């Protein structure tokens, strides 16, 4: 304030879950707690089992582009292999029908 005095308006609460993999993503970089993830355990930053908060900073995504590209290549090759299997079954069925 302007009177050389400050006030506290609130304290941001943090949530921790037993099962992180159980949280169902609802989009808009937002998660919703469900039965598999359990009930949310609430607390404050830096106390208990919570990490502290960094001010003036944002956490970026953990997506590495190189690994994604290589996995895309491998998955494309696997998809084409499965398509080859489908073609094989097609030729087998065509051979039997042409009998």
């Amino acid at each position: 304030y302007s009177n050389e005095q400050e006030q506290v308006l609130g304290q941001i609460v943090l949530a921790n879950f037993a099962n992180n993999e159980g949280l169902a993503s609802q989009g808009d970089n937002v998660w919703a707690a469900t039965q598999a993830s359990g009930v949310a355990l609430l607390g404050t930053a830096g106390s208990g089992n919570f990490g502290k908060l960094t001010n003036g900073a944002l956490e970026a995504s953990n997506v590495d582009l190189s690994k994604e590209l290589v996995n895309m290549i491998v998955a494309q090759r696997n998809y084409q292999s499965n398509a080859q299997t489908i073609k094989t079954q097609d030729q087998i069925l065509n051979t039997l029908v042409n009998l």
Binding site: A18, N19, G22, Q35, A36, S37, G38
Partner: protein
């Protein structure tokens, strides 16, 4: 890690293993495998039952000048050390151990609890460490020590040890090792699986 704190695979089948029983918990391999679970159950405190203080002593130390002993006066003793023990509720008791050289190779050690404000200052020898011809501890390496009663918690009595302590021409008296088997309550911070299959919660 599912909602019930069990280790399960993607399809939900529970991983099995040898469970841990007893205090301190150890893997008992004589039992049948059971599903592995990781509870958040706070860990309770353990009052101390065994403490150890390995220290090296200087031979050239002169005897204290200002007889009698006072825990207040620094010149009244040769050395002072601190060991933190824990009672039934996990409260910290800071045992101060005081070394006064009495005769050649003879060191009286006093024990005083500084965490209890109403505890009286010791006036009589708690133990007399005896060192042989060359450091080699001779007798008096183990003493029963009783804590004070703080905030209604049960006082923890324990065996305090001076084994493998030596007294030679070392430059000064400094503590080498202090250990104790007690701990204060703690909450689950992390969990890990070792390469030997043990699941360990920190």
């Amino acid at each position: 890690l599912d909602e019930n704190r069990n280790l399960v695979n993607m399809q939900g089948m529970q991983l099995t293993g040898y469970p841990a029983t007893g205090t301190p918990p150890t893997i008992q391999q004589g039992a049948n495998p059971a599903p592995i679970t990781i509870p958040n159950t706070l860990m309770a405190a353990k009052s101390t039952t065994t403490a150890s203080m390995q220290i090296n002593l200087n031979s050239t130390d002169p005897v204290p000048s200002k007889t009698p002993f006072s825990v207040s006066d620094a010149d009244s003793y040769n050395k002072k050390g601190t060991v933190t023990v824990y009672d039934s509720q996990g409260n910290a008791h800071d045992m101060n151990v005081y070394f006064v050289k009495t005769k050649d190779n003879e060191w009286a050690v006093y024990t005083h609890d500084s965490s209890d404000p109403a505890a009286t200052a010791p006036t009589t020898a708690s133990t007399t460490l005896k060192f042989n011809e060359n450091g080699i501890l001779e007798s008096g390496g183990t003493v029963n020590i009783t804590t004070g009663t703080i905030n209604g918690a049960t006082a923890a009595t324990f065996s305090l040890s001076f084994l493998n302590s030596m007294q030679q021409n070392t430059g000064a008296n400094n503590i080498v090792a202090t250990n104790q088997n007690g701990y204060k309550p703690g909450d689950l911070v992390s969990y890990q699986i070792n390469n030997d299959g043990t699941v360990v919660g920190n």
